[PDB]
Design a protein around this ligand. Sequence first.
Ligand SMILES: NC(=O)c1ccc[n+]([C@@H]2O[C@H](COP(=O)([O-])OP(=O)(O)OC[C@H]3O[C@@H](n4cnc5c(N)ncnc54)[C@H](O)[C@@H]3O)[C@@H](O)[C@H]2O)c1
Ligand SMILES: NC(=O)c1ccc[n+]([C@@H]2O[C@H](COP(=O)([O-])OP(=O)(O)OC[C@H]3O[C@@H](n4cnc5c(N)ncnc54)[C@H](O)[C@@H]3O)[C@@H](O)[C@H]2O)c1
Ligand SMILES: NC(=O)c1ccc[n+]([C@@H]2O[C@H](COP(=O)([O-])OP(=O)(O)OC[C@H]3O[C@@H](n4cnc5c(N)ncnc54)[C@H](O)[C@@H]3O)[C@@H](O)[C@H]2O)c1
Ligand SMILES: NC(=O)c1ccc[n+]([C@@H]2O[C@H](COP(=O)([O-])OP(=O)(O)OC[C@H]3O[C@@H](n4cnc5c(N)ncnc54)[C@H](O)[C@@H]3O)[C@@H](O)[C@H]2O)c1
Lengths: 428, 428, 428, 428
Amino acid sequence: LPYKVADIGLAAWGRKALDIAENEMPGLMRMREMYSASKPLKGARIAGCLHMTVETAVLIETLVALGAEVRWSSCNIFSTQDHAAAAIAKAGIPVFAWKGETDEEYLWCIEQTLHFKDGPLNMILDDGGDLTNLIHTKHPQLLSGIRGISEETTTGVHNLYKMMANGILKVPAINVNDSVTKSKFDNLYGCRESLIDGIKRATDVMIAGKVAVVAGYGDVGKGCAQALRGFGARVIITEIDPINALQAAMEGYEVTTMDEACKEGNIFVTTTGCVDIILGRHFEQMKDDAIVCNIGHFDVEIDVKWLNENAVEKVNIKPQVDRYLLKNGHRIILLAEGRLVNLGCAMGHPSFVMSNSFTNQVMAQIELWTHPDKYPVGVHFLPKKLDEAVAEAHLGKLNVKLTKLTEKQAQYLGMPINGPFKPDHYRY
Amino acid sequence: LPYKVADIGLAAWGRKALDIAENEMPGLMRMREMYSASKPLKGARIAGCLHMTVETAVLIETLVALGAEVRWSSCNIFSTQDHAAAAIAKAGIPVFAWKGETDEEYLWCIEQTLHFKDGPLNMILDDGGDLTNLIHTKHPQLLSGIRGISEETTTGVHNLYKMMANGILKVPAINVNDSVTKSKFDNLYGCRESLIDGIKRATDVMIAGKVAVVAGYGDVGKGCAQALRGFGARVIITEIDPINALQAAMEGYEVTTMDEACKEGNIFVTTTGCVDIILGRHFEQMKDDAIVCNIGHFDVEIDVKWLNENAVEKVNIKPQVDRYLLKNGHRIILLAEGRLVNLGCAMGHPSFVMSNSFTNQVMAQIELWTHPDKYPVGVHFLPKKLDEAVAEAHLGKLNVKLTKLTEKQAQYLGMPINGPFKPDHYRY
Amino acid sequence: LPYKVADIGLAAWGRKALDIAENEMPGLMRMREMYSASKPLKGARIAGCLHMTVETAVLIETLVALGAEVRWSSCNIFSTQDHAAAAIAKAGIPVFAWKGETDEEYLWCIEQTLHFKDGPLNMILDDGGDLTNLIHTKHPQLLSGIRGISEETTTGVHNLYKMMANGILKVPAINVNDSVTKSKFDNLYGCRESLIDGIKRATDVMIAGKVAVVAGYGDVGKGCAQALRGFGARVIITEIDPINALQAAMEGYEVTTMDEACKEGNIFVTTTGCVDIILGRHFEQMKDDAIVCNIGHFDVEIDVKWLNENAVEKVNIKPQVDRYLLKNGHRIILLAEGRLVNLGCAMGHPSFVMSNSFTNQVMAQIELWTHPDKYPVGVHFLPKKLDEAVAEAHLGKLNVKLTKLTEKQAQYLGMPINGPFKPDHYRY
Amino acid sequence: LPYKVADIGLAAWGRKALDIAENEMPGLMRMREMYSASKPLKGARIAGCLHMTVETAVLIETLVALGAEVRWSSCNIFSTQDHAAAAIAKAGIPVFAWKGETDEEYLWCIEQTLHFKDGPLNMILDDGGDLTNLIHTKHPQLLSGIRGISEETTTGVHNLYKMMANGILKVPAINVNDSVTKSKFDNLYGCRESLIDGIKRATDVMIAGKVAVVAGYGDVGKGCAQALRGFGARVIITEIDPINALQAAMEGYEVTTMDEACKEGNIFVTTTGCVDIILGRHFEQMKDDAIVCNIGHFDVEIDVKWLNENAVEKVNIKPQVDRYLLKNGHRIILLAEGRLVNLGCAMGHPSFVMSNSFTNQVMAQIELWTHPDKYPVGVHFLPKKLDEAVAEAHLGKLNVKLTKLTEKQAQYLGMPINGPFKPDHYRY
Ligand SMILES: NC(=O)c1ccc[n+]([C@@H]2O[C@H](COP(=O)([O-])OP(=O)(O)OC[C@H]3O[C@@H](n4cnc5c(N)ncnc54)[C@H](O)[C@@H]3O)[C@@H](O)[C@H]2O)c1
Ligand SMILES: NC(=O)c1ccc[n+]([C@@H]2O[C@H](COP(=O)([O-])OP(=O)(O)OC[C@H]3O[C@@H](n4cnc5c(N)ncnc54)[C@H](O)[C@@H]3O)[C@@H](O)[C@H]2O)c1
Ligand SMILES: NC(=O)c1ccc[n+]([C@@H]2O[C@H](COP(=O)([O-])OP(=O)(O)OC[C@H]3O[C@@H](n4cnc5c(N)ncnc54)[C@H](O)[C@@H]3O)[C@@H](O)[C@H]2O)c1
Ligand SMILES: NC(=O)c1ccc[n+]([C@@H]2O[C@H](COP(=O)([O-])OP(=O)(O)OC[C@H]3O[C@@H](n4cnc5c(N)ncnc54)[C@H](O)[C@@H]3O)[C@@H](O)[C@H]2O)c1
C-alpha cells in the first residue's frame, strides 16, 4: 500500500504542528543544517518502529533530509497522532499507523516497512524490541542486509543483550537508551516537567502544603521529587538502593518505607519500575482522598485490582480519574488507572526532551550506516563524542556559550579541543 | 421567582462537584463544625454578589448552615458554573445566576437578592462593589437597614474608600481583601500553582532552560517567579519600586528594564497591574516564538492591538493560543489574548486558595452581624484574631501541629494565649 | 575628656577595616555623595548610643560628613570594636567606648556625649532605650533642646511606646526598627547568612542530611529555615501563630511542636524571642550529640540552667562550645551558652545588612532635624518614601536597573513617578 | 623506633578529638561493630600513607580493630594534625608523622611503614601514589609480598593506570576514588558545605545579591553553584563540555565564557582542574573588590603571578587574604593565594564526607585481602556491592529507613535482594 493513516485529510493540521515543534527541537534541526548536503544516510532504507507523533514526524523528516529512504510504523497501537502521520503520509512517506489499532493491524504495519522500492530495509530504528524481533524470528533472511540497529528503550536494550547472549543477535546495535543526553531527558527532565501536568490536569489540586511520597529515587524519582518540592510540597522518598537513598537524604528529603509513608502522604507517585509498590494494606492507611498515581512502569506498580476488588464504590470522575470509596470510609483518587500519569492525564514530555532522545537516534543511524565494519554484532553504547554532540546541538537554542579549550589547556588536560572531555566511567 | 438558573438539571452533578471541593475547603468546613449548631448568623439576611462556582456554593451553604438567610447572584456574566448554581437552587437557595448573561440580566439578577420573605437584606457580601453600589445608588431606602458590608477585591475596596471619601458610604464595611490569608493565597500562592498550568495547557512547552521575564515583583510576581524558577528557568525581574526590586535581587534574580529584557526572554509574564508593560518596540526585539502572557490586570498590560495591527499573519493555534508573524520574521505566541493566563488557559486558583478568601468572608459576616454597635460607618480591616482564625481553620488539613503558648510565655510575651499574636504593622 | 578608647594605637588598623567596609555599605556612601555639600545635618549635635564597630564607625563619619557634630557611646559594654573606636577617636570624634566596660563606665560613657563645645545635644540616635532613658530620667532639662530621636530596636521602640503612654515621651521619635529595609535585613537576610557561620565555625559540622528544628517562623525563622534548607537539611518548624505556621506549611516545612520535634532534630535553632522554648524534658529526648543554639532573644529561650544542673558532665570544647553528658548517656553540644550564635560563634551580620539598618538611621536624622515642626511628640514610623530611598541606595552596588514609571502609567496607577509606590498597609 | 610524632603529649587531647569525630564517621563505626569480632583483616600488615588527621586516625583504629597490623605516615608534610598523630602513637600504633616535615623526613617517614615485627608490608593503603611508587621504584623486593593496593585520589589513580600501561605495576589495585560514595562526598557534597565557609571566614561578605561566577560544572562546580545559589547569588557557569553545560542550563544557570563573565561577577570560583582559567585580561575587567578564589586544582587555575607582577599595591588583609590595587583603580581580593579556599580559608570537608572516603578504603582493604586469587595485576574499581555497602553504613545516622526488596520483586527486577542494585554503567 502507499501508506495507511486514519484520516489523510488531517494532514494540513499536522504540518502546522510539526512546524511549531521544529522550533523546540533544535537538535534534529541542526542535524538537518549540518547534513542536508552531505546526505550521510544516502543509501539507507530505514524501517522505523516508533510512536508516530509530531516529534517523531520531525525525526523522520530529518532522516529523509539527510538522504535516507524511510518507511515507518508506530510501536504502540494508540501512541500515534493522526494529524502527524497524515502529514508524513502526505509528504510522500510510507507510514502505516493510526491511533487505535489491533494487534493484527499492529504486526501488519511493521511488516509493511520491510521492503522498499529497490530492495528490503538495510537499517533499523527501533523503540521496544518489536521491529528487531519480528525480523529476527519471522524474517531472518533479511538480517544479513541490515547493517545496523538503534534501540532507545530499557526493554529493547535488555532484549538486545538477551538475544546477544543466546547468539540470536545477528546485526550490530547501538544503545541510545543510556546516552546521558537521552537518559537525563527522557527520565529526569521530562518527568520533572510533565508529572505535575498530569496531576493538575486531572485534579486541579493545590500541591503546596501537601505531603507527597515518591517511591524510588532514580532519574525519574529525582525529577518527580524536585518538581513537587518546587511547588511547596513535603516530599518523602522510599528506596531499596542505599546509594540512591543516601542522595535523597543529602538533599533534605525524608526517606522511609511505604508501610510508614502511606499513613502520611497526600499524593503518592511511584517511580520504581517494580511490582507491588502500593498495596491494599497501604490504601487502608491513606488519608481521605489521597491522590495515587504512577509514572514509572506501565501499571505493575500500584495494586489496582485490590482497589477494584475491595472498594465499596468507584466513580469515574473524568477520563483517567477514578475515585474509590473504601470500607473505612476514606476515598482514594486514582490516576490513569495506574498507567503513566504524564501520558495518561497530560501530554507526556515536551518537544525539547524528544529532540534529545530522537537526535540520539539520528546520531546512531548516521554512525552505524556510515561505519560499515567498525561495529561488531552486539549492543554497543553511543560513542561519547556523539553524545557530547547532541548536547551541543541544543546549546544555542538555550543561548549557552561553550568556552573552547586552548591548545595549551588541551595538552595540559591531555584531551582534544573537541574530542571526548570525560572518560567512559564519568557519571555526570 | 425562587431562583433563576440556566438549568436545574445539573443539580445532582453540582452536588457531586461540591462534595469533592469541600475536602479542599477546610476553612468553610471548620466554620460549620464550629458554628452550625450555634448559628451565629441567625437572623441575617445576606445578599451575596460573587461568581457562582463550586467553591462559592460551598461558601453559601456555610453561611446558610450558620443561621443566615441568603440570596445570591454572580459578579461576572460568565464566571458562573451552571451545575454549581443549579445545586444551590436545588437546595432551596435563591440563586439568580447563569453563565453568559446579558449585561441587562445581570443587574436584574442582583435586584432579586435584595428582598427576603421576612424583609429586605440587612447584610451585604460583595466581590467587586456592584451590590454595594447598586444598593447605594438605586436603593438608599435599604441602606439604614443593612448592618454591614463585606468586600474582598481591590476594585471593590478602592470603591469603598472612594465612596467614604465622598461621604456617600452609609454602612460599615470590612476589607477582607487585605487580610494576609486572603492576599497571600489569592495573589502569591494561587498564581504560583496556576501560572505554569496556563503556559503548559496552552503550549506544552519545556520551561527549564528558558529565560522567563516577569514584570513586577509584588505578590503575583513573587509567586510567578518562584514557580518558573522551580522549573529550571532563568527568571529576570523588572520593577519600579526599589524595595520589591531589592527583594528580588536578594533572592538571586536579575532585575532590569523590559527595554533590555525583551531581547533575552523566551517567556514573558506580566504581573504589574499597570498599563504599557510590553509594547511593540519590545515585541520587535523578542526572539522567535517568545511566549507572552499576562496574569496581572485583565488586558491592560500587553499591547495586543499592536500585535493585531502590525503582524503579517495571525493564526489561532487553539482556543486562547494565537501566533503572530512579525515583519522581522519572528513569531510571537500570545496567550489568552493578553488576558489572565491562569483563568484563560488553565482553571484558575485551586479550591484551597478559595477556601482562604471565603473563610475570610464568613468571618467578616459573623463579626459585623454579631457586633452591631462596634463598627462606625467606614471601611475597616478584618481584626487580626479573625485573620489568624481563618489561618488556623486550614492547619489540620495541612498536617500542621500548632503549639499553644503557656501562661508564663504569654505573660513574658505580653500577648493573650489565644489573642492576636502580632501587631497590626506586622508584615509577615 | 577628648574621648576614651582602649588603645588609640589601634587607630591605623581600624581605618583599614573601615575602608573595606565602605565598599559593602553602599547606602551610607550614597548618603555622603548625595549630601556632603548640602550638609543637611549642619547644626545637629548628635549624641549616639550604638555598638562601636566598624560599620557604626562608617555610619558616624557619614553623619559627620553631612554637617553633623557628633559624640558617640556604645550601647553594649562588649560590642565595641577597639580599632574602630580608635579610628573615630583619632579622626577627632568624641567616642567613649572600649570592649569590656563596667556598668559604671557604661553609664559614664553615655553621659560624656550629652554636651558639645557649643551647647548640649539637640538630636538623639539610639539603639536600645538607654540614651533616650538616661536623659528622660536623669537629665530631663535637656529634653526641650532635643529636636528628635531615632530608635532601631524592638526594645527601644516598645519603651518609646510605653513612655509615650505614660506621658513621659517629651521628644518626637522615629521608629527605624520597622522599616521594611531595616527589618528584612536585620532579621531575614542577616540571620540567613550568619546562622550557618556560627554553627560551622563552632562545630565544622556537616549540615546536609540532618534534621534541623527551628522554633518560630517569623523573619529570623524564615531566614534560618531557608538557610538550612539550602544546605541539604530537613527543617522542621514550630510555631504559636497560625498565620506563620501556614506560611511554613505552604513552603514545604513540617510544622510540629517541640514536644515532638525534640525526638527528631539533629540541630535546634530558636528564633522565638520568648522563654522556655527548649526545656529539660526536650534534652532528655534529643539524639546523641544534638547541636542546640539560639539566634533570637539573648539567652531566655534555651533552658541552660537545666543542662548545668542535671548534666553528669560539661566540658568546654572551645569558646562558645560546651558539650554536656546527660544521665541517659547522650551528649548535647550547646553554642554560645544560649546567647546569640551568630554574634557569639561568628561575626554577626555582614556590612551590607548593617548598611541598610544604619542608612535608616541617617534617613531619620536628616528628616527629624530638617523638619522642625512636622513631627508631634510620639514614636512615628519612617515615611515610606524614605524607606524606598534606602532600598534604592543599594541597587547599583547590586547592579539592579529600576525602571521608571512613565507619566502615563503614573497617572494610571494614581501614584507619583517617584513618590510612594505602595500604601501604608502593604506587607511586602 | 616505634613511632615518630612531633609531640606525644597531645595524645590525651587527640583522643578527645577522636571520640567526637567518631559520631560523625558512622561508616568507620559500622565497619567495627560489623567486623571487629570477626577480624576480616586478620594477618594483614597494612602500610598506609595518608594525611594524619583526626578523621584518618578513626580510620586507622578501624583497620586495627579488624585484625590488621598497621604502620602509618602522612602523604603531605603539613596536613598531619599532631594531637591526632600523638594519640595513634599513644595507642601503640607506629605513626611516623608530624606537621611541617622537611621533604627529606617525609621519604624517611614512609620508609618506616614498610617493615613489621613479623615481616614486611603485604598491603598498601595509599593516598597519592607515593607509597606505591616508593615500593615499586625503591623496594621491588617487597612487591611480590604485597597482596593488594587501595588508592583514593585522581593523581594516585592516574599513576596506577600509567604504571600499568608501562607494565610496571606489579600488584593489583582498587580505585576507590571513582566509587559514587567517594566521589560524591569528596567532590560534590564536601565542597558544597565548605566553599561558602572559606569565603566567609576570609571576608565575612554578604553572598546574597552578588553575581558569583563558577568556572566548571563537574562535581565541584555543581556543589559550589548549588551552595552560592542557596545564599541568593546569581550564579553564572562557564564550561568546555557540552553536556555539563547543558546540565547547568537545565537548572537555571546562565552559561557563558570567562571572557564575558569577568565583567559581571563579584565572586569568582574556579572548579576546573585546568590551567589558565582567570588571566590578567579578566582581572582588568572585574568590578571593584571582586573576590577570586580557587577550589579545584591547587594554584594552576588563577594567574596569581600576574596579580603579583601588575598590581600597584598588595596588602595582606589577614592570613590567606590578600588585596591588590590594579592600575585601573580596582582592587582584587584573592583568597588562599589561589590555593584551595576550603582548605586554605576554612577547615576543609566535614568528618562525614571523610567517613565515606575512608569506609571506601576499609572496604577495598578487606576485599583484596580476603580474595587473594581474585584480582589480576591491574587497577580495578570497587565492586558495586561494596560501594552500596559504604552508602548503607551511613544510612541510619541519616535517619533513613531503607526498604528491602521482597523475593517476588527481587525476581521481577532480576536482581538479588542484597546483591548489587544497578548495572555498572548506572550514573546515579
Ligand atoms: N514518561 C514516563 O512516564 C517515563 C519516562 C522515562 C522512564 N520511565 C520509567 O519509569 C521507571 C523508573 O525509571 P528510572 O529511569 O527512574 O529508573 P532507575 O533505575 O534510575 O530508578 C529506579 C529506582 O527505583 C528504585 N526501586 C526499585 N524497587 C524499589 C522498590 N520496590 N521500592 C522503592 N524503590 C525501588 C530503585 O532502587 C531505583 O533506584 C522505569 O519503569 C522507566 O522505564 C517513565
Ligand atoms: N488570578 C489572577 O490572575 C490574579 C490574582 C491576584 C491578583 N491579580 C492581579 O495581578 C496584579 C498584581 O497584583 P499584586 O497583588 O501582585 O500587586 P502588587 O502591588 O503587590 O505588585 C505589583 C508590582 O508590580 C510593580 N510594577 C508596577 N508597575 C510596574 C511597571 N510599570 N513595570 C514593572 N513593574 C511594575 C510594582 O512595583 C508592584 O511591586 C494585579 O492587577 C492583581 O489584581 C491577578
Ligand atoms: N543577629 C541576631 O541574632 C538577631 C537579629 C534580628 C532579630 N533577632 C531577634 O530574634 C528574635 C526573633 O525575631 P523575629 O524578627 O524573627 O520575630 P517575629 O516577631 O517576626 O517572629 C517571632 C516568631 O516566634 C514565634 N513564637 C513565639 N513564641 C513561640 C514559641 N513559644 N514557640 C514557637 N514559636 C514561637 C512567633 O509566633 C513569631 O512568629 C527576636 O528576639 C529578635 O529580637 C536576632
Ligand atoms: N576539597 C577540595 O577543594 C577538592 C575536593 C575534590 C576535588 N577537587 C578538585 O576540583 C577540581 C574539579 O574536580 P571535579 O571532581 O569537579 O572534576 P570534573 O572533571 O568532574 O569537573 C571539571 C569540569 O570543569 C570543566 N572545565 C575544564 N576546563 C575548563 C575550562 N577551561 N574552562 C571552563 N570549564 C572547564 C570540565 O568540562 C569539567 O566538567 C579537580 O582539580 C579536583 O581534583 C577539590
